[PDB]
Write an enzyme that holds these catalytic residues in place. Sequence first.
Site, PDB file in Angstrom:
ATOM      1  N   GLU A  71       0.738  -0.803   0.225  1.00  0.00           N
ATOM      2  CA  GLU A  71      -0.296   0.238   0.245  1.00  0.00           C
ATOM      3  C   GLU A  71       0.507   1.019   0.270  1.00  0.00           C
ATOM      4  O   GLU A  71       0.666   2.095  -0.201  1.00  0.00           O
ATOM      5  CB  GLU A  71      -1.079  -0.326   1.111  1.00  0.00           C
ATOM      6  CG  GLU A  71      -1.983  -1.204   1.355  1.00  0.00           C
ATOM      7  CD  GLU A  71      -3.235  -0.834  -0.037  1.00  0.00           C
ATOM      8  OE1 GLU A  71      -2.966   0.099  -0.903  1.00  0.00           O
ATOM      9  OE2 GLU A  71      -4.336  -1.293   0.024  1.00  0.00           O
ATOM     10  N   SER A  96     -11.267  11.070  -2.765  1.00  0.00           N
ATOM     11  CA  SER A  96     -10.607  11.093  -2.229  1.00  0.00           C
ATOM     12  C   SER A  96      -9.052  10.238  -1.864  1.00  0.00           C
ATOM     13  O   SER A  96      -8.675  10.771  -3.332  1.00  0.00           O
ATOM     14  CB  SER A  96     -11.636   9.950  -1.469  1.00  0.00           C
ATOM     15  OG  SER A  96     -11.333   8.396  -1.800  1.00  0.00           O
ATOM     16  N   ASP A 101     -14.935  -3.785   9.791  1.00  0.00           N
ATOM     17  CA  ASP A 101     -15.809  -3.853   9.052  1.00  0.00           C
ATOM     18  C   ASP A 101     -16.479  -4.416   7.517  1.00  0.00           C
ATOM     19  O   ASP A 101     -18.220  -4.046   7.747  1.00  0.00           O
ATOM     20  CB  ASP A 101     -15.969  -2.207   8.059  1.00  0.00           C
ATOM     21  CG  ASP A 101     -16.987  -1.180   7.455  1.00  0.00           C
ATOM     22  OD1 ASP A 101     -17.220  -0.319   8.501  1.00  0.00           O
ATOM     23  OD2 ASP A 101     -17.353  -1.267   6.587  1.00  0.00           O
ATOM     24  N   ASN A 124      -8.800   5.275   3.625  1.00  0.00           N
ATOM     25  CA  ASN A 124      -8.772   6.243   2.298  1.00  0.00           C
ATOM     26  C   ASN A 124     -10.142   7.141   3.477  1.00  0.00           C
ATOM     27  O   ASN A 124     -10.228   6.801   4.334  1.00  0.00           O
ATOM     28  CB  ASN A 124     -10.280   5.761   1.766  1.00  0.00           C
ATOM     29  CG  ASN A 124     -10.782   6.452   0.826  1.00  0.00           C
ATOM     30  OD1 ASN A 124     -12.005   6.646   0.309  1.00  0.00           O
ATOM     31  ND2 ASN A 124      -9.805   6.800  -0.087  1.00  0.00           N
TER      32      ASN A 124
END
Length: 129
Positions: A35, A50, A101, A59
Amino acid sequence: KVFGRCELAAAMKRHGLDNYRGYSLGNWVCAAKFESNFNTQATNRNTDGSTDYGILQINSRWWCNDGRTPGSRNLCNIPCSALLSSDITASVNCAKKIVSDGNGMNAWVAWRNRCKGTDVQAWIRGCRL
Ligand code: NA
Protein backbone atom coordinates in the site's frame (compact mmCIF):
# COMPACT_ATOMS: atom_id res chain seq x y z
CA LYS A 1 9.19 8.02 8.13
CA VAL A 2 10.02 5.00 5.98
CA PHE A 3 9.89 1.96 8.25
CA GLY A 4 12.10 -1.04 7.89
CA ARG A 5 10.29 -4.34 7.45
CA CYS A 6 11.08 -5.75 10.89
CA GLU A 7 10.70 -2.33 12.55
CA LEU A 8 7.17 -2.02 11.21
CA ALA A 9 6.37 -5.62 12.08
CA ALA A 10 7.44 -4.97 15.68
CA ALA A 11 5.45 -1.75 15.84
CA MET A 12 2.35 -3.45 14.40
CA LYS A 13 2.71 -6.29 16.88
CA ARG A 14 3.14 -3.93 19.81
CA HIS A 15 0.01 -2.08 18.73
CA GLY A 16 -1.88 -5.39 18.67
CA LEU A 17 -2.23 -6.16 14.97
CA ASP A 18 -0.74 -9.66 15.12
CA ASN A 19 -3.76 -11.97 14.65
CA TYR A 20 -6.25 -9.08 14.84
CA ARG A 21 -9.47 -10.48 13.32
CA GLY A 22 -7.42 -13.56 12.57
CA TYR A 23 -4.94 -11.86 10.20
CA SER A 24 -1.40 -12.83 11.01
CA LEU A 25 1.22 -10.12 11.40
CA GLY A 26 2.63 -10.97 7.99
CA ASN A 27 -0.66 -10.01 6.33
CA TRP A 28 -0.45 -6.51 7.83
CA VAL A 29 3.22 -6.13 6.96
CA CYS A 30 2.51 -7.25 3.41
CA ALA A 31 -0.42 -4.84 3.15
CA ALA A 32 1.71 -1.94 4.34
CA LYS A 33 4.45 -2.99 1.92
CA PHE A 34 2.20 -2.89 -1.12
CA GLU A 35 0.00 0.00 0.00
CA SER A 36 2.68 2.50 0.97
CA ASN A 37 6.10 0.85 0.57
CA PHE A 38 6.47 1.33 4.36
CA ASN A 39 6.29 5.12 4.00
CA THR A 40 4.13 6.69 6.71
CA GLN A 41 3.75 9.83 4.54
CA ALA A 42 2.36 8.06 1.47
CA THR A 43 -0.70 9.83 0.08
CA ASN A 44 -2.51 8.87 -3.09
CA ARG A 45 -5.44 10.65 -4.67
CA ASN A 46 -8.33 8.52 -5.89
CA THR A 47 -10.43 9.44 -8.93
CA ASP A 48 -13.49 9.94 -6.71
CA GLY A 49 -11.55 12.75 -5.04
CA SER A 50 -10.74 10.92 -1.83
CA THR A 51 -7.18 10.28 -0.73
CA ASP A 52 -5.46 7.29 0.85
CA TYR A 53 -3.20 8.19 3.72
CA GLY A 54 -0.29 6.68 5.49
CA ILE A 55 1.31 3.33 5.94
CA LEU A 56 -1.97 1.51 5.35
CA GLN A 57 -3.40 3.99 2.83
CA ILE A 58 -6.52 4.66 4.85
CA ASN A 59 -9.12 6.39 2.72
CA SER A 60 -10.65 9.79 3.48
CA ARG A 61 -14.11 8.83 2.14
CA TRP A 62 -14.91 6.80 5.22
CA TRP A 63 -12.22 6.78 7.86
CA CYS A 64 -10.48 10.09 8.27
CA ASN A 65 -11.15 13.76 7.63
CA ASP A 66 -9.01 15.69 5.15
CA GLY A 67 -11.46 18.56 4.61
CA ARG A 68 -11.54 18.04 0.85
CA THR A 69 -13.65 14.89 0.32
CA PRO A 70 -17.24 16.15 -0.03
CA GLY A 71 -19.75 13.74 1.48
CA SER A 72 -17.08 11.95 3.52
CA ARG A 73 -17.36 10.30 6.89
CA ASN A 74 -14.63 10.35 9.49
CA LEU A 75 -15.28 7.04 11.22
CA CYS A 76 -11.85 6.93 12.80
CA ASN A 77 -12.62 10.46 14.00
CA ILE A 78 -9.15 11.61 13.16
CA PRO A 79 -7.53 14.18 10.80
CA CYS A 80 -6.05 12.36 7.82
CA SER A 81 -2.74 14.10 8.56
CA ALA A 82 -2.60 12.04 11.75
CA LEU A 83 -2.26 8.93 9.58
CA LEU A 84 0.99 10.33 8.22
CA SER A 85 2.82 10.50 11.55
CA SER A 86 6.01 8.60 12.17
CA ASP A 87 4.09 7.02 15.06
CA ILE A 88 1.70 4.53 13.44
CA THR A 89 -0.63 4.30 16.44
CA ALA A 90 -3.46 6.20 14.74
CA SER A 91 -3.08 4.22 11.51
CA VAL A 92 -3.24 0.93 13.42
CA ASN A 93 -6.28 1.92 15.49
CA CYS A 94 -8.05 2.98 12.31
CA ALA A 95 -6.98 -0.18 10.46
CA LYS A 96 -8.50 -2.17 13.34
CA LYS A 97 -11.73 -0.33 12.71
CA ILE A 98 -11.47 -0.92 8.95
CA VAL A 99 -10.71 -4.64 9.09
CA SER A 100 -13.73 -5.14 11.37
CA ASP A 101 -16.11 -3.38 8.95
CA GLY A 102 -17.28 -6.49 7.11
CA ASN A 103 -14.90 -7.42 4.32
CA GLY A 104 -11.81 -7.98 6.49
CA MET A 105 -8.54 -7.11 4.88
CA ASN A 106 -10.22 -7.09 1.49
CA ALA A 107 -10.83 -3.44 2.34
CA TRP A 108 -7.21 -2.95 1.17
CA VAL A 109 -7.11 -3.54 -2.59
CA ALA A 110 -3.34 -4.11 -2.52
CA TRP A 111 -3.75 -6.77 0.18
CA ARG A 112 -6.44 -8.58 -1.78
CA ASN A 113 -4.53 -8.41 -5.06
CA ARG A 114 -0.96 -8.96 -3.79
CA CYS A 115 -1.04 -10.54 -0.31
CA LYS A 116 -4.22 -12.61 0.07
CA GLY A 117 -3.46 -16.30 -0.18
CA THR A 118 0.27 -15.80 -0.49
CA ASP A 119 2.97 -16.94 1.91
CA VAL A 120 2.56 -13.83 4.09
CA GLN A 121 4.78 -15.40 6.74
CA ALA A 122 7.71 -14.45 4.49
CA TRP A 123 7.03 -10.84 5.52
CA ILE A 124 8.03 -11.43 9.13
CA ARG A 125 10.98 -13.73 8.42
CA GLY A 126 14.11 -12.79 10.36
CA CYS A 127 12.38 -10.32 12.67
CA ARG A 128 12.93 -10.65 16.42
CA LEU A 129 9.25 -10.72 17.31
NA1 NA B 1 -13.75 11.61 5.46
